[PDB]
Design an enzyme around this catalytic site. Structure first.
Site, mmCIF file in Angstrom:
data_model
loop_
_atom_site.group_PDB
_atom_site.id
_atom_site.type_symbol
_atom_site.label_atom_id
_atom_site.label_comp_id
_atom_site.label_asym_id
_atom_site.label_seq_id
_atom_site.Cartn_x
_atom_site.Cartn_y
_atom_site.Cartn_z
ATOM 1 N N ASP A 1 0.845 -1.188 0.000
ATOM 2 C CA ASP A 1 0.000 0.000 0.000
ATOM 3 C C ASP A 1 0.883 1.242 0.000
ATOM 4 O O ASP A 1 1.682 1.440 0.921
ATOM 5 C CB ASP A 1 -0.928 0.003 1.216
ATOM 6 C CG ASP A 1 -1.745 1.280 1.329
ATOM 7 O OD1 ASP A 1 -1.805 2.046 0.345
ATOM 8 O OD2 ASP A 1 -2.330 1.517 2.407
ATOM 9 N N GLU B 1 30.817 14.081 2.207
ATOM 10 C CA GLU B 1 31.384 14.099 3.552
ATOM 11 C C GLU B 1 30.220 14.170 4.534
ATOM 12 O O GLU B 1 29.498 15.171 4.575
ATOM 13 C CB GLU B 1 32.334 15.281 3.723
ATOM 14 C CG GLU B 1 33.486 15.302 2.724
ATOM 15 C CD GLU B 1 34.334 16.560 2.827
ATOM 16 O OE1 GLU B 1 34.222 17.280 3.845
ATOM 17 O OE2 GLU B 1 35.110 16.832 1.886
ATOM 18 N N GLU C 1 28.636 14.556 7.947
ATOM 19 C CA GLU C 1 28.710 15.031 9.321
ATOM 20 C C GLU C 1 27.461 14.600 10.082
ATOM 21 O O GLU C 1 26.349 14.657 9.552
ATOM 22 C CB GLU C 1 28.853 16.553 9.353
ATOM 23 C CG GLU C 1 30.294 17.038 9.248
ATOM 24 C CD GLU C 1 30.408 18.496 8.824
ATOM 25 O OE1 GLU C 1 29.655 19.338 9.358
ATOM 26 O OE2 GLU C 1 31.260 18.801 7.957
ATOM 27 N N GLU D 1 34.454 15.765 14.755
ATOM 28 C CA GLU D 1 34.271 17.031 14.068
ATOM 29 C C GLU D 1 34.308 18.185 15.070
ATOM 30 O O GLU D 1 34.637 18.010 16.247
ATOM 31 C CB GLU D 1 32.972 16.999 13.261
ATOM 32 C CG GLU D 1 33.197 16.912 11.754
ATOM 33 C CD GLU D 1 33.787 18.186 11.157
ATOM 34 O OE1 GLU D 1 33.558 19.281 11.719
ATOM 35 O OE2 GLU D 1 34.478 18.090 10.119
ATOM 36 N N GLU E 1 32.392 12.696 11.648
ATOM 37 C CA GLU E 1 32.296 12.636 10.195
ATOM 38 C C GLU E 1 32.946 11.354 9.702
ATOM 39 O O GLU E 1 34.050 11.006 10.133
ATOM 40 C CB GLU E 1 32.961 13.858 9.547
ATOM 41 C CG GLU E 1 33.083 13.782 8.029
ATOM 42 C CD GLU E 1 33.668 15.048 7.428
ATOM 43 O OE1 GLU E 1 33.484 16.133 8.022
ATOM 44 O OE2 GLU E 1 34.324 14.956 6.368
ATOM 45 N N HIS F 1 29.020 18.120 2.627
ATOM 46 C CA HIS F 1 29.814 18.602 1.480
ATOM 47 C C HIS F 1 29.645 17.505 0.440
ATOM 48 O O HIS F 1 29.568 16.347 0.813
ATOM 49 C CB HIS F 1 31.224 18.962 1.944
ATOM 50 C CG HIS F 1 31.211 20.125 2.875
ATOM 51 N ND1 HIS F 1 32.324 20.648 3.493
ATOM 52 C CD2 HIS F 1 30.173 20.852 3.299
ATOM 53 C CE1 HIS F 1 31.954 21.665 4.255
ATOM 54 N NE2 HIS F 1 30.654 21.805 4.153
ATOM 55 N N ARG G 1 38.016 27.418 1.332
ATOM 56 C CA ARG G 1 36.950 26.688 2.081
ATOM 57 C C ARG G 1 35.825 27.606 2.581
ATOM 58 O O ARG G 1 35.083 27.170 3.483
ATOM 59 C CB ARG G 1 37.565 25.902 3.245
ATOM 60 C CG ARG G 1 38.005 24.492 2.877
ATOM 61 C CD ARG G 1 38.639 23.755 4.042
ATOM 62 N NE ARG G 1 38.591 22.311 3.871
ATOM 63 C CZ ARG G 1 39.444 21.611 3.129
ATOM 64 N NH1 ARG G 1 40.418 22.227 2.484
ATOM 65 N NH2 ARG G 1 39.318 20.299 3.036
ATOM 66 N N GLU H 1 33.397 20.770 -5.041
ATOM 67 C CA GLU H 1 32.821 20.455 -3.737
ATOM 68 C C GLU H 1 31.735 21.479 -3.444
ATOM 69 O O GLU H 1 32.025 22.670 -3.287
ATOM 70 C CB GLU H 1 33.900 20.455 -2.655
ATOM 71 C CG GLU H 1 33.392 20.137 -1.259
ATOM 72 C CD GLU H 1 34.494 20.189 -0.211
ATOM 73 O OE1 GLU H 1 35.239 19.193 -0.077
ATOM 74 O OE2 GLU H 1 34.616 21.226 0.476
ATOM 75 N N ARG I 1 29.180 22.838 -0.860
ATOM 76 C CA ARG I 1 29.219 22.822 0.596
ATOM 77 C C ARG I 1 27.921 23.284 1.245
ATOM 78 O O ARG I 1 27.833 23.295 2.478
ATOM 79 C CB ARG I 1 30.381 23.696 1.082
ATOM 80 C CG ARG I 1 31.556 23.729 0.113
ATOM 81 C CD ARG I 1 32.695 24.602 0.620
ATOM 82 N NE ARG I 1 33.387 23.992 1.749
ATOM 83 C CZ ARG I 1 33.460 24.517 2.965
ATOM 84 N NH1 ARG I 1 32.917 25.693 3.248
ATOM 85 N NH2 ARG I 1 34.091 23.846 3.924
#
Ligand SMILES: [Mg+2]
Ligand SMILES: [Mg+2]
Ligand SMILES: [Mg+2]
Lengths: 438, 437, 437
Positions: C50, C126, C128, C182, C189, C238, C309, C326, C328
């Site tokens: 269902d 990545e 976290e 972290e 992480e 990330h 970063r 990457e 983020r």
């Protein structure tokens, strides 16, 4: 013979005690424990007992009754450690050998025999919903063991281990389980097993409740098949899949027919809907059953049948062939499976025997319809209260005859006993609503 | 004028605040406190307020209403401070038109129709109520004592508070007749002299106000709920009723059998005819039907008789200007204005059309069998609140007398309570089924 | 065939139950447990169920669905008993047609469109997450330890459970790369090797399943909620992404400046173009925007750069077959199937139409002024969940790629959470105003 294998299993598995099971009219399991030394006597003449203390059975002046075991139902209880235990599901006979009219299992047997006259064997595959509740001071409560939902997974589903334990035990008893999953409400779950004939499926329903409640107790929990134990969450219901078989083939399947459903399917549905109001007193036997079957809410209370629409009362799922079936969604797990299957088979056969045309299909969402809209379509509703359904059951001359006057009266007696107590009660809701103001 | 004496009393008793009382359709008292400096404005053009937030009054888009006080109802509240007074009010619209949703106006209308025929209706109710303990400032259903009918201290632990209530009532002009401990635990009854329906209804609202206020001062909770405790008696508002025409009691006829006039029998015939629909008014709560339970010692069976205390309508012994009938089905939670109006309209329908009542039943109706009751044709009242509301919908006479507005408000609140009550999972169900199923 | 080896594994490891996994639109794992005797039926015609009670799937009137397992996803759950296995499933309709509301099918569709151009998308996230204590069996937001970035025992109190998770993951075929504590209290992480978007999304759902299950066995609660504790870091997913065509990395071009191909820049140009609308998918919760707060150290400012970063899109140093970007802005609570699909469709729109990205920003974007950001033309992500849903409604490309069905389900659940969140009276308001006002 069959009795030879029973004693062969006893010697090998070292069975020392046998439980002679049966049910009263309410569907509550009952049993007598005998040493294995009495097993020859139990399978022969049978074990006599006093029936006057069983609900809706006999009177005190004519109380002697006999347990007649069904050899095919012999299983060994897997949770036995030295010292094993086995069980036998029994029928009830009178001292003269006459079958006791009031035995629910005999009733289903009678209705299945009539269906066999016409070449039909009813197969049933129910969807058992139930709750797992916590115990507080050894006493059961209505507190969910987890706050999960439909199809949820651990860590949201906290009962994966006990459900794995239940399924394994059932498989050890010859069950063929199909699926197990967490149901909508908190701590609600559903176990589905493969369809079988009405009698075997009913034996399986009683067995599943025994296994579930037993293992839950071993885990400090309480399993309950009560229909609506918690207010504000989904109620547990017993969707009953049904199909008729004749000459080995699915009598509901017809490839040359519209939607590939035979007229036998339609006539069977027509009969079930024709008597559904009275049937509800059997499939929904408690006062509490109608706090799940409430008019005007998301519940299968509107008397309709449709395709794969899960808002109607009778559903016709997609699978065809030897899987063609109909799903009746009104029953809940607290019913006596022997009497429920008997009442459905009786009504459905009445529709086939007499070519009762069913009403138009309703492929719309019935839950979202207006009362005005429902009136235009002629959609009726199920009884709102237990007293409402009992009155409907009294008038159904076919059902009372199919179940027997003895069983029917016992159902009416226990129901009106519950109602006469419930209607006099003063509940907290009434105090919470009026006490401060009036 | 009446207004002049009101201000004479204000200066002597040094009244500084005046409460403008009224009721919603449910009979719950509502009021606004105005300083005595605004009293001149209230007795003149009136005091405007918002009626959208009153139960069963007006919508949000046309909500401006006007309180119009009745000067005859001015009383000084005997619990002073800083004295305080109160006025009972009729609700009118800004254009001066009476608001036909106001319960007090409804009774006035039906009484004006009774005056057209020269009839004046008199009522005197027996007010049963409970006295309960307070726990953490919140009311409970714990009886203040464990006494019984006509019990005396120390068994009766509420003598001091009943003495206070009667004193306050007499100070407010009541003619109190008797007070006593009733059957159930912590249950009591205060009876006051009869009066016209409008006066008596004001007295009913006042009695509940005085009883509930003094109960709070003693740390208790007085409740006029019909059946607050299971297994003990329930509170019932027996209602004595009589009609007066040309100054004499219209129910009395010395030349008739039992000295009962045809107007009496016709009035009873009409009340019994509509009693199934009246019950929605006189017994308006879900809880009302836990006292009006079929098959128990309760006025559920539709019959009329003499001084037999088991029938629905009782004709006590007194004749002359004291001839009356006693309707025993109502309970104290009803709106007295609406209840008296529904009884008046139904009884006048009986007199107007000469509706013959059924044969009396002087036996013990509670001790009859269901088989016996069917032979005599005895019917029963509605079993639930929904059953009575459904019977009230089909009563074209009652809805027309109370008015489409008030009738719809009554149906809305009742079905609101019912839709909530029918979906509840009660403890009784868990106690009965959880362990075994 | 693949099905033959599945049954070979069942007998050797003595598997007795198989869980049929999938996800709703919200990314929450859903499963059905079937005995191993039903496995033959599942890998053939499938198992019906269902779908009306699954979030954002089908209506009540057409609810019958079919689970169709992917045989490649068969793994044995290393916590045995009575061994257990699982299969990830695609949801199909009874007629064999794929259910276009199934998130996993959506990703498959967009990947098939990428294959039309010869592109295969690879992702490596990545992950976290937080490890919280349980109090009275219920989860809390109390950190299991008070440690920080790269901290070692005894400061890091979760070494034993991380060791267990990685072991289980490696046993499930994961190629784990590293695990560490972290920044925030009790935050950790785990990073695993990249793979195609479909494989990686299955890995993401599996990692959360393994992490949350083992956390429960240790009496803890692993949560991938974005910002569960105010005043500490938030969890961020990330997402490293790269495109492959003809076996080689389409983002790498040795003859280009910085060895970055035009396909890379065009892909970035398209992602940034739709990033305001993608955020509704990659950051789907109200709580997601308590980590994506404008004006704080969080990837809120729409920019792309090199190994800086602080930008929204980062182009790390590795080139060759390791060239990647990457992203983020996402957080772990997003549906990986839907997030990867939305990124793929937007990036391919950039490549398809050669959408030039804006100038890189290699400075510290967090330390810029609002005045400085306006000169450079730096925009910001949506501030709230409603802001992102409104931006997602107007993105015709994204709604068409995800499908009208999935898009509507996403909007329904989001506005459901929002209409409840906007009406709440929070404690902050009582702390701020109750004493003084
Ligand atoms: Mg279900
Ligand atoms: Mg009395
Ligand atoms: Mg990190």
């Amino acid at each position: 013979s069959k009795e030879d294998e029973i004693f062969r299993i006893v010697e090998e598995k070292n069975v020392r005690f046998v439980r002679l099971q049966f049910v009263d009219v309410q569907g509550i399991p009952k049993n007598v424990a005998i040493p294995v030394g009495q097993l020859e006597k139990a399978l022969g003449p049978g074990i006599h007992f006093d029936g006057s203390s069983i609900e809706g059975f006999v009177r005190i002046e004519e109380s002697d009754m006999v347990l007649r075991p069904d050899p095919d139902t012999f299983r060994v209880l897997p949770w036995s450690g030295n010292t094993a235990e086995a069980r036998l599901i029994c029928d009830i006979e009178l001292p003269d050998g006459k079958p006791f009219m009031g035995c629910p299992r005999q009733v289903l047997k009678k209705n299945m025999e009539e269906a066999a006259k016409l070449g039909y064997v009813m197969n049933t595959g129910p969807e058992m919903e139930f709750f797992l509740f916590k115990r507080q001071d050894g006493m059961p409560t209505n507190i969910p063991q987890d706050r999960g939902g439909y199809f949820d997974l651990a860590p949201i589903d906290l009962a994966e281990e006990i459900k794995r334990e239940i399924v394994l035990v059932l498989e050890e008893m010859g069950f063929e389980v199909e699926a197990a999953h967490h149901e909508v409400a908190f701590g609600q779950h559903e176990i589905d097993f493969k369809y079988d004939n009405a009698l075997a499926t009913a034996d399986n329903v009683i067995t599943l409740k025994y296994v579930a409640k037993t293992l839950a107790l071993q885990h400090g929990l309480h399993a309950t098949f009560m229909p609506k134990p918690i207010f504000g969450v989904n109620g547990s219901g017993m969707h009953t899949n049904t199909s008729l078989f004749k000459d080995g083939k699915n009598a509901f399947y017809d490839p040359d027919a519209p939607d590939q459903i035979s007229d036998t399917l339609r006539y069977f549905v027509g009969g079930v809907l024709k008597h559904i109001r009275a049937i509800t007193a059997i499939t929904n036997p408690l006062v509490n059953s109608y706090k799940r079957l409430v008019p005007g809410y998301e519940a299968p209370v509107y008397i309709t049948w449709s395709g794969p629409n899960r808002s109607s009362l009778i559903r016709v799922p997609a699978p065809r062939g030897n899987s063609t079936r109909i799903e009746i969604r009104s029953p809940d797990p607290s019913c006596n499976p022997y009497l429920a299957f008997a009442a459905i088979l009786a009504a459905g056969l009445d529709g086939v025997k007499n070519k009762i045309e069913p009403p138009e299909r309703v492929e719309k969402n019935i839950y979202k319809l207006t009362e005005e809209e429902r009136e235009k379509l002629g959609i009726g509703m199920l009884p709102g209260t237990l007293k409402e359904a009992i009155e409907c059951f009294k008038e159904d001359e076919l059902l009372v005859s199919a179940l027997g006057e003895h069983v029917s009266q016992s159902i009416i007696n226990v129901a009106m006993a519950d109602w006469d107590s419930y209607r006099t009660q003063v509940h907290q809701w009434e105090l919470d609503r009026y006490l401060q103001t009036y």
